[PDB]
Structure formats: C-alpha cells, structure tokens
Amino acid sequence: QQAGTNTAENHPQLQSQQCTTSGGCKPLSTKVVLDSNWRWVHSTSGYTNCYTGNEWDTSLCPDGKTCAANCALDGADYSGTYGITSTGTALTLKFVTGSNVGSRVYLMADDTHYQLLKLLNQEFTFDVDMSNLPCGLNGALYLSAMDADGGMSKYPGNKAGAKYGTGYCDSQCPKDIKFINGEANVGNWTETGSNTGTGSYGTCCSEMDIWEANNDAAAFTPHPCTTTGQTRCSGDDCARNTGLCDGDGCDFNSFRMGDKTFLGKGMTVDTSKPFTVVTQFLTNDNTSTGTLSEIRRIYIQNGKVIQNSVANIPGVDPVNSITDNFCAQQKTAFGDTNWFAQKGGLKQMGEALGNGMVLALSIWDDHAANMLWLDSDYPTDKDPSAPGVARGTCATTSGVPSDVESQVPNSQVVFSNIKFGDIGSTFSGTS
Ligand SMILES: OC[C@H]1O[C@@H](O[C@H]2[C@H](O)[C@@H](O)[C@H](O)O[C@@H]2CO)[C@H](O)[C@@H](O)[C@H]1O
Numbered sequence: 001q002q003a004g005t006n007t008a009e010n011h012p013q014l015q016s017q018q019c020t021t022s023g024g025c026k027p028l029s030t031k032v033v034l035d036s037n038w039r040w041v042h043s044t045s046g047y048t049n050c051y052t053g054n055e056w057d058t059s060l061c062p063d064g065k066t067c068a069a070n071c072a073l074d075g076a077d078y079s080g081t082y083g084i085t086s087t088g089t090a091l092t093l094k095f096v097t098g099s100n101v102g103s104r105v106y107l108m109a110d111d112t113h114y115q116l117l118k119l120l121n122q123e124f125t126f127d128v129d130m131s132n133l134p135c136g137l138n139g140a141l142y143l144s145a146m147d148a149d150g151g152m153s154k155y156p157g158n159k160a161g162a163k164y165g166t167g168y169c170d171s172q173c174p175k176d177i178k179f180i181n182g183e184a185n186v187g188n189w190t191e192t193g194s195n196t197g198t199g200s201y202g203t204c205c206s207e208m209d210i211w212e213a214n215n216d217a218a219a220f221t222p223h224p225c226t227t228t229g230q231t232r233c234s235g236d237d238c239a240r241n242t243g244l245c246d247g248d249g250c251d252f253n254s255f256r257m258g259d260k261t262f263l264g265k266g267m268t269v270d271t272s273k274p275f276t277v278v279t280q281f282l283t284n285d286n287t288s289t290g291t292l293s294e295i296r297r298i299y300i301q302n303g304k305v306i307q308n309s310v311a312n313i314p315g316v317d318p319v320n321s322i323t324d325n326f327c328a329q330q331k332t333a334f335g336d337t338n339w340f341a342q343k344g345g346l347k348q349m350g351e352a353l354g355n356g357m358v359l360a361l362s363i364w365d366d367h368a369a370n371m372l373w374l375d376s377d378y379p380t381d382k383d384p385s386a387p388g389v390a391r392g393t394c395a396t397t398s399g400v401p402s403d404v405e406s407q408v409p410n411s412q413v414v415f416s417n418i419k420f421g422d423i424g425s426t427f428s429g430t431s
Pocket residue numbers: 172221247248249251336368369373374378379
C-alpha cells in the first residue's frame with residue numbers, strides 16, 4: 001500500500017517506562033498507531049475508495065500488486081472516527097464509534113518504527129480499568145512478531161510501513177488482513193460481515209497474549225509458530241493449529257483452571273476497579289540467552305500484592321505459572337491437543353520474545369466464537385462440567401456481535417502505566 005496525504009497522521013502519545021534494577025524507571029516518549037485494516041484506502045491520485053464496506057474496487061484492484069500500486073492508506077481521526085484517546089499515559093479504547101467497531105493500535109518508538117520489546121528475562125507491567133468492559137468484549141494487550149517497520153524493507157509494494165500500522169500478523173494466521181507482503185489480499189475475496197472479508201492469503205507469526213480479558217474473566221496465553229517472523233500463508237499452512245501456528249495456545253485463565261472466585265467483580269482481583277498486572281518471562285539460567293522456562297503473573301490492587309491463583313484440576317499439578325509441564329498437563333486434562341508443544345512450546349515462544357516483538361492494544365468483539373472461549377462455556381457442544389469447558393460466568397448466549405454492538409456500544413477499556421524491564425524492577429514492595 002502507498003502512503004496517503006489527504007489526512008495528516010498524528011500518532012497519539014502514550015508514554016511508557018523502561019526500568020532497571022540499579023537505576024529504576026525512566027520515561028520513553030512512545031506513541032500509538034492505528035492498525036492498517038481500520039484505515040481509509042483510496043486511489044493515490046485522489047479521493048476514490050479502493051475499498052468500501054466489504055468489497056474492493058476491481059477497477060483499481062484487479063490483482064494484489066496493481067491494487068497496492070494504486071491505493072494509499074491515509075491518516076486517522078483517532079478520537080472522532082475510532083474512539084481512541086490518550087492522556088499521554090493512559091489509553092482509552094471505546095467499543096463503538098458511529099459505524100466503527102473496535103480498534104487495534106501498536107506501540108511506537110517514533111513515527112516510523114514500532115517499539116521492539118525484547119522481554120526474555122524481563123517483565124512487562126501495566127494498569128487496566130475494565131469497569132466498563134462487560135461480557136462478550138475483549139480488551140487485549142499482547143505481543144506479535146511483527147517487523148519494526150511494518151514490512152517496508154522486505155516488501156517493495158509497501159510504502160506505508162509502521163507509520164500507517166501495516167504488517168500485522170498473529171498466531172491465527174488471519175486472512176481478513178487487507179494488505180500482506182505489500183500486496184492487497186484481494187484473491188478470492190469473500191465477504192464475512194458488513195465491513196469485513198477474507199482473501200486467499202493469511203499472515204502468521206508467534207504471539208504472546210499478555211492480557212485478554214473483560215470484567216468477567218481473563219487469560220494469558222503464549223502461541224508459538226514454527227516460523228520466524230511475519231509469514232504470509234496460503235492453503236493448509238494457514239490452517240488453525242495444524243498449519244504454521246498454534247492457534248489455541250497454552251492458556252492460563254484462573255476460572256478455567258479451577259478457581260472461580262479469584263478474579264471478577266468484587267473478587268480478590270476486583271475487576272470493578274483498576275489494577276496492575278505484572279507478567280514476568282523467566283529463563284532457565286536467568287539470562288537473556290536462556291530458554292524461556294516460566295511465565296509468572298503478579299497482580300497489585302489497592303497496594304496489595306496478589307500472587308496468581310493456583311490450578312485446581314485433577315491431573316494438573318497445583319501451580320500458578322505457565323511452564324511446559326503445566327501445558328502438557330492441562331492439555332491432557334482438558335482433552336485438547338498440545339499444538340503448543342508441537343510448535344516448540346515455551347522454547348519457541350522464547351526465541352520469538354528474544355528476537356523482539358511489537359505491542360498491540362485492542363478492543364474487539366468476536367464474530368467466530370462470541371468470546372465464549374474467554375468468559376463462558378466452550379466449546380458449545382461439550383459438557384460444561386468436564387474439566388476445562390467453563391471459563392467464566394457469562395451466559396452461553398452472550399457476546400454475539402450484533403447484540404453487544406447495539407446493547408453496550410459505549411463499553412471501553414483503559415490501559416495505563418505501561419512499564420517494562422528487569423525482573424522485579426517495574427514495581428516494588430515494602431513492610
Ligand atoms: O478460536 C477461539 C479462541 O480459541 C482459544 O483456544 C481454545 C479453543 O478453541 C478450544 O478449543 C479450547 O478448548 O480452549 C481454547 C483456549 O480457550 C484461543 O486461545 C483464542 O485465541 C481463540 O482463537
């Protein structure tokens with residue numbers, strides 16, 4: 001895609017802090033940028049759309065290369081069109097804004113590069129307010145193995161780059177992404193909703209879901225892929241789990257893991273109020289070259305340090321962190337295939353973290369599964385009493401997009417106080 005000039009692109013500021021044991025925390029002047037899928041795409045020589053609703057203009061876009069040559073991504077009215085605002089340290093993502101639904105942004109080092117986070121033997125910490133983020137919604141904060149320039153160096157057809165939010169990939173190998181590898185994904189374009197469709201290619205990479213949650217339920221989930229970095233897929237390489245990527249991941253949701261009273265409204269982690277979420281990526285030798293061996297989680301709310309809940313499922317050791325053994329055990333216990341191990345488990349996830357990953361923040365609803373995998377019973381054909389089926393208390397009828405979009409359109413998530421750095425250094429304690 002080309003870089004459009006009809007609307008200035010001004011990235012909202014969202015300061016983060018980088019911390020060390022000896023020196024404490026220092027601010028970085030990071031920014032956020034809207035993902036390319038949400039933007040206006042129009043002819044390079046004017047105002048005519050290349051894409052309207054859920055279809056491409058086959059005149060401007062008869063094939064992927066012609067389309068990318070003819071078509072520019074343009075700047076965004078962050079608040080007015082997308083419901084995205086920042087105070088400078090706190091990011092508010094609103095659900096529905098006019099006819100727009102949801103958003104995804106990436107953390108930027110400067111106006112043309114994503115911030116590349118290398119989090120092996122490091123931790124990532126943030127605050128979240130989910131008080132207005134109900135059943136059926138997901139306020140997500142996560143890492144993808146995107147290129148820092150959004151693919152510009154690799155793909156001559158992409159002249160827009162990170163400044164316009166290009167180059168997305170994730171462990172679901174999504175085929176609804178409009179530009180991949182510098183070409184519009186127009187082959188066999190198939191409508192999937194009023195504003196969305198899929199093409200013949202998907203875009204795959206390893207993904208670490210630090211946080212997917214709403215005020216009912218939360219999960220953290222590594223998803224390794226056998227590939228290294230953003231990879232375009234076709235055919236069965238794109239296929240969930242059996243292809244390049246572990247689509248299911250190895251997840252830790254406290255409720256799914258057998259503690260129904262740890263996290264939620266008025267619970268130990270009280271989701272009716274803001275709280276702090278720490279995630280630590282430990283290596284086997286406590287160096288940045290070691291093998292990722294454990295992902296730990298600590299919460300802090302009202303100044304109380306709250307350790308993660310313990311697993312309480314027959315056949316699963318009662319642990320409170322993600323490890324390769326926990327993953328094997330829960331997968332066996334829940335009857336799920338360990339695609340995670342097949343793709344290389346924590347070691348493969350860790351090599352992606354070591355190479356550097358891009359931070360995404362998003363608010364979304366779920367056309368595929370109604371977010372039931374997060375906050376309800378899932379899959380919908382299994383006995384809710386079987387180990388693993390129940391993930392929250394939201395009704396099994398909840399989360400259909402047309403419903404939440406009309407019922408709770410002013411839902412929002414607020415992400416703030418973003419920090420990363422040495423383990424134990426982004427927060428402190430005392431007696
Ligand atoms: O596809 C929806 C959702 O799947 C989660 O993976 C599931 C899964 O689909 C399932 O069959 C199983 O038993 O539990 C999983 C974990 O909730 C993914 O983690 C999520 O990213 C979505 O992709």
